[PDB]
Amino acid sequence: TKFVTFLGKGGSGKTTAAVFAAQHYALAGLSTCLVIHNQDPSAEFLLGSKIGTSPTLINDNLSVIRLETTKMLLEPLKQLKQADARLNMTQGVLEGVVGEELGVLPGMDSIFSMLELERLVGFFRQATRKNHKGKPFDVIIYDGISTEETLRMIGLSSKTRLYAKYLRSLAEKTDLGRLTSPSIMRFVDESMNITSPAMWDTLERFLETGASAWRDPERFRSFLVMDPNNPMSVKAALRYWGCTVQAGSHVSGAFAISSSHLTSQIPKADFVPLPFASASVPFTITGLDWDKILLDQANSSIRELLSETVSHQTVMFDTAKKLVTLFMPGFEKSEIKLYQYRGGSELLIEAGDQRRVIHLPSQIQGKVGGAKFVDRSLIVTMRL
Amino acid sequence: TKFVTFLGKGGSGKTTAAVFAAQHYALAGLSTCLVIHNQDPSAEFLLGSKIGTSPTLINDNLSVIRLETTKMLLEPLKQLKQADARLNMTQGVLEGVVGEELGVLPGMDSIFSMLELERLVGFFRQATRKNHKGKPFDVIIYDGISTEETLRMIGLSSKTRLYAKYLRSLAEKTDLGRLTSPSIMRFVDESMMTSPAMWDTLERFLETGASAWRDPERFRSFLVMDPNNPMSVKAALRYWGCTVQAGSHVSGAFAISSSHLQIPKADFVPLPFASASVPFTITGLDWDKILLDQANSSIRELLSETVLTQTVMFDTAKKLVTLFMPGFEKSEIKLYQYRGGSELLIEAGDQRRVIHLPSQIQGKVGGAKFVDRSLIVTMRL
Ligand SMILES: CCCCCCCCCCCCCC(=O)OC[C@H](COP(=O)([O-])O)OC(=O)CCCCCCCCCCCCC
Ligand SMILES: [Mg+2]
Ligand SMILES: [Mg+2]
């Protein structure tokens, strides 16, 4: 199962591009799941149908679902209630929790959205959510809360390690920790399935496996989108390009989405080397004709690109000159801050409100001497 | 301190409206803070200035900050390292945590955004974050992650009280709770009484902030739409309903356009409606022209007047619960009863809202009828 998502400013065509992509992949023979996690009614208009928590099959290959956190939070509570019935740790307090009454709090949308995607795509383990034919989906297209939140998920796998290690330290090297951690570890074990020091090691390995997949381009694919007629939309795309790099990933292409009744202009100059394409999806009052849209010659390019991408570098090291070349589109030198908290072993990059640790090879290891921003790449010279 | 935010679909003029409002309030003499929590460069083009974590003063009354979770997390960690040194709860382990190395994970943007806004507005407690004159801001304008996430923030105070009840139970009615809760309640204290006092005061502090988030003199939300995009207008009606479901209210609706050229004032009755014309050119924006434009007099007046509160109505005679539910269809509104006939749970817009029914109205749902945009629920005894 592969994962596809669209990144861009509000009004840049993300939702339009997500539905277009889902229709294209389904028409092409791929079992496709379009996942919506928001309250924007645009998708329902584009699809010509109301979508809900239960899958809606547009055709035999296009399944659409709306995630609802009110419903998603119920399953974890049910599992926790099952564990407490075996361990009686809460003296029945958990059993009295009416999950059907609980409201959605800040942060819950992002966290539960991330949990459902794991079941659908299978980043950290094999996917468990199957399509209506009992098999796993071929493509998962995700139209999420926001570009910035989607980016927290893309780069999630790499950055969990340090959190888990600090948490293990607080569990195994503190009074209250050695007191609580035992039972908590026993409860999370029961709740998940149907010794403590050892439970922490397996967890760390399970985290490492998730970074191999989320990094694997044969699992995740990101596309930039922009309204070609809005200068702010184009500029935001370039910014989100660098935010994607800073998340630890890459962009697979850039699209100019025109939902108006005009031919889609292409501002292809600023986004090379990315493959560029445009799409014309007019918002007709009588309902979209997807047969016509998908067959329009103007969309032939984007359709090919989409299929070639699912069909199948940010750092370049120079061992001789002691250099780390960091591609940083959408950023200015002033916005990129370099830190070193682990000696010459690693280099931390701070930009776009995200931190990225770049472990340095033996030859490059050292302290930062200077840096220069040429074009859109920062050349960092190391000193030994 | 007052709070202002704009709700609408992507590309509907939210950020444009927020910068317009910030300029208007500062010009009216109010100490204004424009808070941006996202990586969208649009605000900088609109303001004509780079924005960062440190405040940028467009004028003596207009401060602009971009929040950054990487930085927002460091200071709270510092406060937690102090309490650990005193109470010795972690035995120096917390002191070894390198906040400056940690990456932002899913959910942290929302949590830390919510914390910073509390310091700036002071809904639960008195505002802590002061302007450059050492005084609380008069107006906080928030342009956040997304409309949906901002609605989770608007509803927090009304929906935590249930979570807090269950957490107090786990702390006072379980063996692990009775053993650890006392120590944990102390550590929280210093970081910022008796444990039962703490819980009792928390529950008061929670309802104190829910009253502030319901106060029209402290919180104002506005719908924005592009009047030439039907999806933008429909989205505004939907987020109106989501605001009601969050436990709050909308104070007005704005049609933002980049030109002076079919406003849907009638579709948003009884909200005060106004249009706004914010022309822009690549060279930048002429805010003196935009703010003196007579086409923008109405939006400026509506912003200045503010600086439906009742969405649930009870009829003790006919035994009815009338729910203002704009933007929803009868099929998108679910009504559940988990406490017998004493309560009514409304599920809509991926949010739940609990209505405690007056003793007279109490009973079981026996019919619902959508009238205009109000759901009339007949309660059967
Ligand atoms: C200001 C508002 C703050 C809100 C902060 C964000 C809260 C969201 C936390 C939700 C995480 C719940 C745990 C979870 O979903 O894991 C699911 C896990 C996987 O099961 P499976 O399907 O793979 O067999 O199966 C399980 O059931 C794991 C159960 C063990 C972990 C329980 C953690 C409970 C967290 C709830 C916290 C609520 C805070 C208000
Ligand atoms: Mg769109
Ligand atoms: Mg805008």
Author numbering:
A (entry chain B): 58 to 251, 262 to 379, 385 to 456
B (entry chain A): 58 to 249, 261 to 329, 332 to 377, 383 to 456
Paper's wording?
In the eukaryotic cytoplasm, Get3 delivers tail-anchored (TA) integral membrane proteins, defined by a single transmembrane helix at their C terminus, to the endoplasmic reticulum. Get3d is conserved across land plants and photosynthetic bacteria and includes a distinctive C-terminal α-crystallin domain. Distinct features of Get3d include an incomplete active site, a “closed” conformation in the apo-state, and a hydrophobic chamber. Both homologs have ATPase activity and are capable of binding TA proteins, supporting a potential role in TA protein targeting.
We generated a construct without the chloroplast transit peptide (Δ1–57) that purified as a single peak via size-exclusion chromatography, consistent with a homodimer. While the sequence suggested missing residues for ATP binding, only crystals grown in the presence of ADP resulted in diffraction. Final crystals, grown by sitting drop in 50 mM sodium cacodylate (pH 5.47), 50 mM lithium sulfate, and 30% PEG-4000, were frozen with the addition of 30% glycerol as a cryoprotectant, and a complete native dataset was collected to 2.0 Å resolution in the space group P 1 21 1. No density for nucleotide was visible in the putative active site; however, there was clear density for an inorganic phosphate and an Mg2+ ion. Like structures of Get3 homologs, AtGet3d is a homodimer with a core nucleotide-binding domain and an α-helical client-binding domain (CBD). A structural alignment suggests that, after NosGet3d, AtGet3d is most similar to the closed conformation of yeast Get3 (45). As opposed to the groove seen in fungal Get3 structures, the CBD of AtGet3d is a chamber. Considering these results, the density, and the properties of the binding site, a phosphatidic acid was built into this density. The aliphatic chains fit the two tubes of density, whereas the phosphate head group forms a salt bridge with R176, R182, and a possible H-bond with Q136. First, in AtGet3d, a salt bridge formed between K107 in the Get3 domain to E404 in the αCD of the opposite monomer is reminiscent of a salt bridge between the homologous yeast Get3 K69 to D74 of Get4.
